[model samples]
Target: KVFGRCELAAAMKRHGLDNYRGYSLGNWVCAAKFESNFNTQATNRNTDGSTDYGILQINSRWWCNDGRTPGSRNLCNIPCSALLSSDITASVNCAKKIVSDGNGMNAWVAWRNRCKGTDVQAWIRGCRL
Candidate 1:
């Protein structure tokens, strides 16, 4: 009975992040499971597997760039810094913008269906407090 939005809020809270209407909860979870498998400290590397960093899988370039800015390198933890600094909501939102021009929930559902997981829309059903 975990509603995706609230569940998403909890997931965001994992990195002390918050969600607004602009940030799509469903899409965030989709990317979370997809990228890091909900691993808060997830990181990826190039084919050489040399460069790596924090959750939502930030690249070393962004890590170093944000370093020169006001925020801490800790802000890159998971989806928080990405959502705050960038306009694409979460990292998933970035993928969504690139692939479908912001129709990521659709893409999420399709991927969920292909993955034998429940649709995020269904997860959000009856999700009123």
Candidate 2:
């Protein structure tokens, strides 16, 4: 809840995520919107017992430690609560690592179903980048 959509976009862009790995800034913004509505503190328990964390909704099964999740891989080596903060450095870094692992935005189900192939420009339409 610390950032408005456009503000989050700006911060993400400033952090070098603008079009990184051929993913558009708008795509990232759109993903964040649908995933967590730009709320950094967001967390969701999935039907499979995994939890999604932060603005990108990074999962506990792979990226973070949520304590309750058994056998969490925690590839990000970060606590799940670390993602639930206004300082987005850790979240952004972890997201880049996730993408680098070949998932792309497909790592986020929100992007796979909602943002992929859709017109993404409106996510940054009025934002001054």
Candidate 3:
């Protein structure tokens, strides 16, 4: 498992994700919670027969590949398994790319459905970075 919320927040800050691309670190943390509960190995079957991967729940259709789907863009050029690790570097880079590519946090359905417009201060509280 990875570090707890405060530590994660501080680490994210070090990675330049504190206010990345106009999205707050709190939003990112909130999204992570709803998407994977900070579990790097998180995966879920999508209704479209694709799979969500890693801490961000990136979609197999555009971001990563699960090998079960054909014609994947694999835009991250990283294996889906790369995202399922506690290291989080690959996943965070991919997440930044997704945000920069105009999707923002909306690329994650969990962010839209759960974290959006919610009080997410708890995600960053007690983190002094």
Residue ranges of candidate 1 with Cα displaced over 4 Å:
1-8, 13-21, 48-52, 65-119, 122-129
What would the per-residue lDDT of candidate 2 be over residues 17-62, giving only the tens digit for each residue? 8888889899999999998988998889998798999999999988
After superposing candidate 3 on the true structure, give the runs of residues whose Cα lies further than 4 Å from its correct spot: none
The candidate with the higher lDDT, 1 or 3, is 3
Per model, state how many residue pairs clash: 0, 0, 0
What would the TM-scores of all predictions be? 0.39, 0.95, 0.91
Cα lDDT tens digits, model 1, 1-129, are 122344544545454333333444444555455545555445454564333333244443333333333433432344334533322235533333333434433334434454334464443345442
Angstrom error at residue 67, model 2? 1.4
lDDT minimum window of 10 residues, candidate 2? 101-110
Give each prediction's root-mean-square deviation over alpha carbons.
8.8, 1.1, 1.4
- Span of 10 residues, lowest total lDDT, candidate 3: 1-10
lDDT of 3: 0.82
Residue-level error in angstroms, candidate 1, position 67: 10
Worst-scoring 10-residue span by lDDT in model 1: 62-71
Give the candidate order by descending TM-score. Answer: 2, 3, 1
Which residue pairs clash in candidate 3?
Answer: none
Judging by lDDT against the true structure, name the best candidate: 2
Ranking by lDDT: 2, 3, 1
